[PDB]
UniProtKB/Swiss-Prot annotation:
Highest levels found in fetal brain and testis. Also expressed in thymus, salivary gland and uterus. Highly expressed in cells of the innate immune system, in particular activated NK cells. Week expression in the intestine. It is found in: Cytoplasm; Nucleus. It comes from the Eukaryota. Interacts with USP7, which antagonizes the ability to degrade mRNA. E3 ubiquitin ligase responsible for the post-transcriptional regulation of common HLA-A allotypes. Binds to the 3' UTR of HLA-A2 mRNA, and regulates its levels by promoting mRNA decay. RNA binding is sufficient to prevent translation, but ubiquitin ligase activity is required for mRNA degradation. Transmembrane segments: none annotated. It is linked to Genetic variations in MEX3C may be associated with susceptibility to essential hypertension. This is RNA-binding E3 ubiquitin-protein ligase MEX3C. Residues 13-74 form the KH domain. Binds RNA through its KH domains. The gene is MEX3C.
Length: 80
């Protein structure tokens, strides 16, 4: 993207990919991004939301234990 850049993570932090069904990206983001903002604050992670018509993949950055916690909150927003 012309308006984004790659930055190295803080020491000890990793970045993983969390794939969701395309229909539930809006559920994870929530109204005005309140849901995805709550996940970042509660899990102490940095999460990039995928674009409009791109791969429904969230990029979660943080400590490995915190990144795993953020992955579960994202995957819980998926109906069976």
């Amino acid at each position: 993207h012309h308006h984004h850049h790659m930055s190295p993570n803080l020491p000890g932090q990793t970045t993983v990919q969390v794939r969701v069904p395309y229909r539930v990206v809006g559920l994870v983001v929530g109204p005005k991004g309140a849901t995805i903002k709550r996940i970042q604050q509660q899990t102490h992670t940095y999460i990039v939301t995928p674009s409009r018509d791109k791969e429904p993949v969230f990029e979660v950055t943080g400590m490995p234990e915190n990144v795993d916690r953020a992955r579960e909150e994202i995957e819980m927003h998926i109906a069976m």
